[PDB]
Each structure stands twice: as structure tokens, then as C-alpha cells.
């Protein structure tokens, strides 16, 4: 009762429809997802090319998830050799490697622009979910920022009154008028700490003697800035991408669906009173389920002690801060 169309060129739409009808066997998940996106028309006169409308061509959500995971599993041998080479690359450097399972659902790259409006970070060649190293480095840096703000908030605020005044003036300039309201909350401390770590690293020389307790170890501010680097000095810790272990993909699914059902969406966007006359607009998106095991590795360029400190910081961040998208809802959390 649904009409499927394909905006790809002719002589290829037939093969795309064969792939989506399971008549043929596709092997690359990113290929079928992106380059062969179907446009589904329901009783409503509109070819909505969204996962909510894309799933309508299957029997149910379970069938869609099973099809996606079978397509993912069809490249298991290639992913296995790729992971073996990746582990060899890890061991080539003096990299410390640790494995972590997903405590809750994880979704990285949800904000990427795509036809589905809700994308997911999939490896181009093999079509498996992965965490880019940039995300890990950023989450570690932000966890360090949060720890510093929570512990040494008033101290750094007093030491850098000029910087906090500059930040308050900037906020007043952009955030409405707010001439001097500018509450000195934890968020302002985090902002000025980030500003110090990004544009005012040299002025952070005095603070470098400070130490903050992470997990069981103690990390200095100088250690953190050496690990991450500045505009004038390169970081010393190499953060590699994280990939799931190939073994677990054989038995449990590595990709599932999740739903967002925004009732009162006009209230949030347009300003209508919430009430209850606000029929929802469900939107589905892919996410790797909880329990999937990922392998992380951090290497060093100058000192292995910095690598160990960065590994501890990243473990703490993944345990508490969380990586990926919708981290405010407990998504993308890892457990030992």
C-alpha cells in the first residue's frame, strides 16, 4: 500500500529496488543507506525519504533491523582483517589499548546532514559504527574542563578576573543585553577555562602547578595542555578511532532503531500553548545498542606517562561524561 521511488539514475533504480526487496544481496551498508535512498509514499501524497517512512516497506521494525544487521554481517571477514591490521597499527606504536562495553545506547554523528535528517557514523568501506578520534579527544578535553571547573572554579576565576570580565562582556554583547547579570555559575567557569586552554595557554603557566584527581591518578594542568596541545605547541597523545570487536557482530546485532516522539513540538518551536492537541511527529534514527564492545587505543609521542594519563582521563570521560549524541539523556555511556 506504499509506493517506492528512487531518485537515482535509470538502470540502477531496478537494482536498488531489488536490494530493498531482499531479492538480491547487498554487502555495503553505507552504499544501500546513502547512495540508494528510497522515497516512500504512503496514503499521504508525499514521498517522504525519512527512516520513519523508509521502514514502512518492511513488515515491522524488527524486520528492518534484521535486514540492516544482515547487511552489516555480510562483510564480517573483511572487517575482521581490517581490525587485525588496526590492532597491528596499535601495537606498532607504544599505544595503550582498553576495551569497553556500551552501558547504554550510543549514537555518534546524529547531527550530520543527510536525506534521512538523522545520520550515523558508519565506516565507508565496511559500514560498521565507529567513534572518530576527534570525538574522543574532544570529550576528554571537555571532561578535563568540567573537572577543573568543579574543583578549581573560584581559584581560576580569581586568578583570571580579567579573562572572566572579558568573557562576561562578550556574553553581554551577544546574549541579548545582559549588561552585568552574567551569573558566575559553573558554566562561566567552564567557558573561561576553555578560553584559557584554547587562546590563552601561555597565561596558564602559573596554573600549571595545579593538580586534579582523576580516578586513582592525579593530573596536572601542564600535563593536560601537553597532552592536548595549543595553537603553538602540538599535542603529545595520539587519539585513535574506536571500532567494535568483530567477534560480537556474529551473534548480537550491532545496529538498532530508536524513536523520538516530539509532542508539543509547535510549543517548542512556534510558541503555541502546550495543551494536548499536539499530535506527535515520530522520527526514527539508527543507534548501536547497549552492550556492544568497542576497542580504544591512545598512543604517545613524547612520554608514555602522558599516554597513561590520557587513557585514564578518557576512561573516566566515557564512564561519566559520555560520547556521541544526546549525552544529556545517558546515551553513549561505557562500563568496565
Amino acid at each position: 500500500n506504499v509506493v517506492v521511488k528512487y531518485p537515482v539514475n535509470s538502470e540502477l533504480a531496478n537494482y536498488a529496488e531489488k536490494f530493498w526487496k531482499k531479492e538480491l544481496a547487498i554487502y555495503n551498508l553505507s552504499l544501500i543507506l546513502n547512495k540508494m535512498t528510497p522515497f516512500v509514499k504512503r496514503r499521504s501524497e508525499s514521498y517522504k525519504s525519512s527512516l520513519s517512512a523508509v521502514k514502512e516497506i518492511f513488515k515491522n521494525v524488527d524486520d528492518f533491523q534484521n535486514f540492516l544487521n544482515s547487511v552489516l554481517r555480510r562483510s564480517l571477514d573483511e572487517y575482521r582483517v581490517f581490525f587485525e591490521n588496526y590492532e597491528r597499527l596499535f601495537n606498532s606504536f607504544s599505544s595503550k589499548i582498553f576495551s569497553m562495553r556500551t552501558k547504554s545506547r550510543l549514537v555518534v554523528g546524529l547531527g550530520d546532514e543527510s536525506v534521512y535528517e538523522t545520520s550515523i557514523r558508519l565506516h565507508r568501506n565496511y559500514g560498521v559504527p565507529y567513534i572518530p578520534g576527534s570525538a574522543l579527544k574532544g570529550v576528554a578535553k571537555h571532561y578535563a574542563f568540567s573537572i577543573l571547573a568543579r574543583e578549581n572554579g573560584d581559584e581560576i576565576l580569581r586568578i583570571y578576573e580579567s579573562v572572566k570580565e572579558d568573557l562576561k562582556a562578550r556574553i553581554a554583547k551577544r546574549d541579548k543585553i545582559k549588561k552585568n547579570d552574567v551569573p558566575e555559575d559553573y558554566y562561566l567557569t567552564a567557558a573561561v577555562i576553555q578560553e584559557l586552554f584554547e587562546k590563552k595557554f601561555d597565561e596558564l603557566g602559573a596554573i600549571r602547578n595545579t593538580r586534579v584527581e582523576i580516578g586513582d591518578t592525579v593530573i596536572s594542568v601542564g600535563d593536560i595542555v601537553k597532552i592536548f596541545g595549543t595553537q603553538k605547541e602540538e599535542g603529545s597523545v595520539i587519539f585513535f578511532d574506536a571500532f567494535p570487536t568483530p567477534e560480537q557482530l556474529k551473534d548480537k546485532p550491532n545496529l538498532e532503531l530508536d524513536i523520538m516522539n516530539p509532542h508539543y513540538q509547535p510549543y517548542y518551536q512556534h510558541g503555541e500553548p502546550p495543551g494536548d492537541w499536539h499530535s506527535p511527529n515520530p522520527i526514527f534514527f539508527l543507534t548501536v545498542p547497549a552492550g556492544v564492545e568497542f576497542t580504544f587505543a591512545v598512543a604517545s609521542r613524547d612520554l608514555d606517562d602522558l599516554a597513561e594519563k590520557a587513557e585514564k582521563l578518557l576512561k573516566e570521560a566515557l564512564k561519566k561524561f559520555g560520547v556521541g549524541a544526546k549525552t544529556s539523556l545517558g546515551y553513549g555511556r561505557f562500563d568496565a
Binding site: 521511488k5 531518485p7 539514475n9 522515497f39 514521498y47 525519504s49 546532514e113 543527510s114 536525506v115 545520520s119
Partner: protein, 152 residues
């Protein structure tokens, strides 16, 4: 010695000035158009040009395979998102199918056919060149939109 860069810049300036003048009051329309313009190249590189055009048409609540750019009015939509999507689709398809004009240096890769219907039954090389031209014109349009149009 008439570089296509001049035609690209002139067309982008004309279209962005047109949307700025026609909807100077609608700041949200300007913001939506700017966001769609600066996000379109990512969609084109990800899912292809035909998929991007079909996505715009779907956001316009219009059927595919039976709609061309000449038969759509961007101002005939109530919603700001629909307004911006229609304007972007019209501008991109107009550049692809006619260029800056018949007498200009660039007359569009497609003679006068609808770019989506052109993509449907053409070779991969033709759609690749069309994608490259669309990327360039979208880059210029995003530049000019960031220049003049207000930010959402």
C-alpha cells in the same frame, strides 16, 4: 575570455539579492534559506544530486517525476521552511538548466530540461559534471547568503 566564475558570482548575487529583497521582513525565511544553502553541499556529496533535489521536492510536498522547476512558485508556500526549500530548489535547478542566461557565457549544462528528469535518464559522467557545477554554484550561493542574509 569569459570565465564561468563571473557568471557563477553574478547569478549567486542576483538570486541572494532577490530573496533578500522579496523577504526583507521575514528574517526567519532568510535564516532558513542560509542554513539550507550551507547544508546542501553536504547532502549532495552524501546522497547525490538527484537525491538532494528529490529531498527538496519532498520537503515541498510535491510529487516527483511530474514536477519541473519552471512550474513552482517559491512564494506560494505558507511555511518558512517550505519557502526556503522552494527558493533553494528553484535557484539550483535554474542554474543547472539555464545558467545565467541564454546570452550569457554559461547557459546551463542541461539545455532546458528539468535537472531531476535529466538526471533520471542520463549517463554517470553527465550527472557527475552536473554535480560539480551544482557544488560550485552552491558554494557561491552560500558565500553570498552568509554575506548579506541574516543568520537564524
Amino acid at each position: 575570455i569569459r570565465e564561468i566564475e563571473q557568471e557563477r558570482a553574478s547569478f549567486a548575487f542576483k538570486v541572494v539579492s532577490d530573496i533578500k529583497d522579496k523577504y526583507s521582513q521575514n528574517k526567519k525565511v532568510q535564516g532558513k534559506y542560509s542554513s539550507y544553502a550551507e547544508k546542501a553541499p553536504t547532502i549532495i556529496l552524501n546522497n547525490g544530486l538527484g537525491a538532494t533535489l528529490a529531498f527538496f521536492l519532498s520537503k515541498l510536498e510535491k510529487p516527483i517525476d511530474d514536477v519541473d522547476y519552471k512550474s513552482i512558485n517559491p512564494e506560494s508556500f505558507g511555511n518558512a521552511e517550505n519557502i526556503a526549500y522552494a527558493f533553494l530548489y528553484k535557484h539550483l535547478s535554474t542554474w543547472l538548466a539555464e545558467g545565467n542566461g541564454k546570452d550569457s557565457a554559461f547557459s546551463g549544462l542541461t539545455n532546458g530540461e528539468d535537472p531531476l528528469k535529466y538526471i533520471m535518464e542520463k549517463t554517470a559522467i553527465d550527472v557527475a559534471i552536473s554535480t560539480e557545477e551544482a557544488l560550485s554554484i552552491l558554494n557561491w550561493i552560500k558565500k553570498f547568503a552568509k554575506a548579506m542574509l541574516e543568520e537564524e
